[PDB]
Amino acid sequence: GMSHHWGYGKHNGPEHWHKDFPIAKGERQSPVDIDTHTAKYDPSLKPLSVSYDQATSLRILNNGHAFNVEFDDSQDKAVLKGGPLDGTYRLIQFHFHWGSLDGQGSEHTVDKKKYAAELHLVHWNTKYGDFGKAVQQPDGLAVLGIFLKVGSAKPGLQKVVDVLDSIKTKGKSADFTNFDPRGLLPESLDYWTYPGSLTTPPLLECVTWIVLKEPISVSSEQVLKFRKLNFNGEGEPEELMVDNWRPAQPLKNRQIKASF
Ligand SMILES: NS(=O)(=O)c1ccc(C(=O)N2CCc3cc(O)c(O)cc3[C@H]2c2ccccc2)cc1
């Protein structure tokens, strides 16, 4: 990806991605708008299982598109299973997408409603051995999406907010151990699910999306700190990292299922 130049600007944004990543106009692209009235309850959907008790965070990195909190996935620790998933998916990293204003920022939408941000907890199917091989499979990844709305502060997120000053620009990373992702989950695990893809290039169609119905609340100060990050690297013209979200894509031949 040393030649990648896609971004979220006017000249390299989502509308341009298809030129280097033709799958952008594929049959199962993400994100999508979740029409709550069209989504059908699926009684066969088993309960979702989120086991982050042994999660081991290692580092936080500004990759120029977002910031990723990375976990040690060399062992079966933080895993996602159940729900529409068959097998075990291991947590590798989480990141967010947010806007320049509270009225936008999420990638998925609910009845066209846009949230201030969206958290993505990325997991890969252990039957494929590693992340690189998993992304080449239709059921290689499971991403748990959680909407963020602005209101009361999320205590469990503050540790992330305070370390952002150390990774302001692209390429910067910082030690980030002992962070518990369980502090970022809402109370309920009710969710919608559908087959889709990564929302950033290479836009591979390797994701089973599980989007929680209940958003979490974060404070205006917390999201404000997110908006102080930079897309550019150190010593380059300052480009605030905001609106790093891809808009809803055509649902096409897909059905969104509800666990409730
Ligand atoms: N938004 S999302 O669909 O949840 C998503 C999931 C995984 C990833 C991811 O973990 N990686 C690795 C880091 C990376 C760096 C880039 O510059 C980039 O353009 C994409 C990624 C993706 C990635 C996924 C699959 C193959 C290669 C890279 C990114 C986004």
Ligand SMILES: [Zn+2]
């Ligand atoms: Zn994402």
